[PDB]
Design a protein around this nucleic acid. Structure first.
Ligand code: MG
Ligand code: MG
Ligand code: MG
Ligand code: MG
Ligand code: MG
Ligand code: MG
Lengths: 70, 123, 85, 122
RNA sequence: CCCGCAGAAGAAGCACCGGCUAACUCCGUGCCAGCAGCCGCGGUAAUACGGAGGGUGCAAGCGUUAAUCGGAAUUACUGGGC
RNA sequence: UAGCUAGUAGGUGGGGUAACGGCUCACCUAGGCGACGAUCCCUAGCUGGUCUGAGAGGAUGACCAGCCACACUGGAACUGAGACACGGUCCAGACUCCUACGGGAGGCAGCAGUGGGGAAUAUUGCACAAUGGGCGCAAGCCUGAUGCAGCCAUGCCGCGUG
């Protein structure tokens, strides 16, 4: 239901009404774009694995084990 | 220090809070699992850990890990939750006892089968 | 209202009726005493006291009231009597 | 004469305490509601953990009126306060379990047999 | 409880195995799936994942999660600091 | 949580209890408590103990025993040696079930048990055979206290699968 009265003539309000209706539908019916998920970048994964491996190396040489010395 | 100061305002005990509040000193709590999905670990571990969002019988809606490889947990599965942080997903402070309350055990886990709730191969 | 021994309701309420009658009797005699006492004559005071002493003492012996109640009554009433004169 | 906007006490334990008659069911432009007459009401006040929350809209049957019904002979029964018993809005089926206060015989109809049983007097 | 039992005779699971903590190989997977008490393992020889073999340890139980105290001299009076 | 308190704090008298006592009443005075924490708010049954610990301490009060409190909720008495009473009384109340519609009747925090709650906990059993308990001169009865078994690897302990 739409009340169009802004203009001074019914011949103008009679198109103001249809304009309001079509402009309503044209956005109350929109199909908003679907947001697909995003995956971590290749370079970011590479940096993660780099840091992980360097930490692995330092944490490995950081310790105490009798491999050689019986 | 200063025995008089201790007499006036005595030393105290820092009450160590519990890291499993939703259990509130109960070993296990059942939940409905209002969500069930996967989420990627924090910085180094680069995976997709299976997690769920549950509503327990004490109102504490909590995120709970989903142990093992493969499962059949859904929107309305009555599950059972024990403590234990995941240390990987920030926020998961609980788990699920696999192999009880609608949760299936991993497929024929030969090791750690008391865990992960799988019956034994009868031999 | 479960076991037999709710005959005790009757066995107790009959006793209560009799006991209330007896207590009213006792303290009406004591109030007669007090009326004499505030009235202003050791004559009437001691009069009521004589005619009430067996009453209160018997009701004390009857296990209705406890003998110390008769004791305190006689004591302070004799006191009021003697202070009036 | 329990018309619109009439605040009513609750002669049962449904949960309400005062309910406003928002419509007199039965017939068009029907004005009033005698005893047996069903009305449409809303809960203007309910107790905290009642069976019905404040604001609900549902039917109700009047049981006590300050106006008073006249018996077949000319004897009248004027209570001191208008009060009604709640009913389910689909089934008549009163909501409350107990029922307080007295009631009348104009309630002694089929659907109100449960009410007239739960009720203590008349 | 006590006398005959003809026959081994109906009766071992559970966890761990990278370090702390002890007890090691192969296989398959190959940032995946997963494991994890803390550190952490996983991109093809994975003693850390899953399986097999084997080892270690408790056993009519074995572990997991509660929960408490200890270690925690991390509320210190004993027995701490600025 | 910094003020609190007015029957309050005392005095005298009267009354009242089994017993002193503002216990209660009528007067008189201005007390009375409060940083050594009053008051208010939250929590909680207290102890012997228990668990840990080297000890102090910390956590603590499931079992057994001692004390207190409560009996659907609120209040009150009655009787009584003793109760303001678990399986008594009266009133009120919410709930629930009956009805010869006038009336009622009921209180598993006893045992067993149900539904429900939960992660979670057992027979709608047997005997009064000892024990204790009440009654009774006593025999003898009552006792879901007990003594027993039912169930659960729930803990401790011992032996077997050679
Ligand atoms: Mg492995
Ligand atoms: Mg320090
Ligand atoms: Mg006095
Ligand atoms: Mg109850
Ligand atoms: Mg009972
Ligand atoms: Mg019997």
């Amino acid at each position: 239901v739409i009340k169009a009265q802004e203009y001074r003539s019914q011949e103008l309000n009679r198109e103001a009404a249809l304009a309001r209706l079509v402009a309503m539908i044209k956005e109350l019916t929109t199909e908003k774009k679907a947001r697909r998920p995003t995956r971590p970048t290749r370079a970011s994964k590479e940096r993660r694995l780099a840091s992980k491996a360097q930490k692995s190396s330092v944490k490995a040489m950081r310790g105490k084990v009798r491999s050689g010395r019986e | 220090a200063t025995v008089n100061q201790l007499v006036r305002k005595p030393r105290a005990r820092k009450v160590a809070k519990s890291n499993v509040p939703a259990l509130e000193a109960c070993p296990q709590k059942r939940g409905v699992c209002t969500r069930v999905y996967t989420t990627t670990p924090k910085k180094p571990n680069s995976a997709l850990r299976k997690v769920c969002r549950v509503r327990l019988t004490n109102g504490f809606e909590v995120t709970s890990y989903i142990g093992g490889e493969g499962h059949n947990l859904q929107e309305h599965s009555v599950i059972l939750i024990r403590g234990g942080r995941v240390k990987d997903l920030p926020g998961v402070r609980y788990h699920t006892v696999r192999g009880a309350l609608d949760c299936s055990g991993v497929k024929d886990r030969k090791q750690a089968r008391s865990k992960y709730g799988v019956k034994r191969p009868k031999a | 209202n479960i076991k037999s021994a709710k005959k005790r309701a009757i066995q107790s309420e009959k006793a209560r009726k009799h006991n209330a009658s007896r207590r009213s009797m006792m303290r009406t005699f004591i109030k007669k005493v007090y009326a004499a006492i505030e009235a202003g004559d050791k004559a009437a005071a001691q009069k009521a006291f004589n005619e009430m002493q067996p009453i209160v003492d018997r009701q004390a012996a009857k296990g209705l009231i406890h003998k110390n109640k008769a004791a305190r009554h006689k004591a302070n009433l004799t006191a009021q009597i003697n202070k009036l004169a | 004469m329990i018309q619109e906007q009439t605040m009513l006490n609750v002669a049962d334990n449904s949960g309400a305490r005062r309910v406003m008659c928002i419509k007199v069911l039965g017939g068009s432009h029907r004005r009033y509601a005698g005893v047996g007459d069903i009305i449409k009401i809303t809960i203007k006040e309910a107790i905290p953990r009642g069976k019905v929350k404040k604001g609900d809209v549902l039917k109700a049957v009047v049981v006590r009126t300050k106006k008073g019904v006249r018996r077949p002979d000319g004897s009248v029964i004027r209570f001191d306060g208008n009060a009604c018993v709640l009913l389910n809005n689909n089934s008549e089926q009163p909501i409350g379990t107990r029922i307080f206060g007295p009631v009348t015989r104009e309630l002694r109809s089929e659907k109100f047999m449960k009410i007239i049983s739960l009720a203590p007097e008349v």
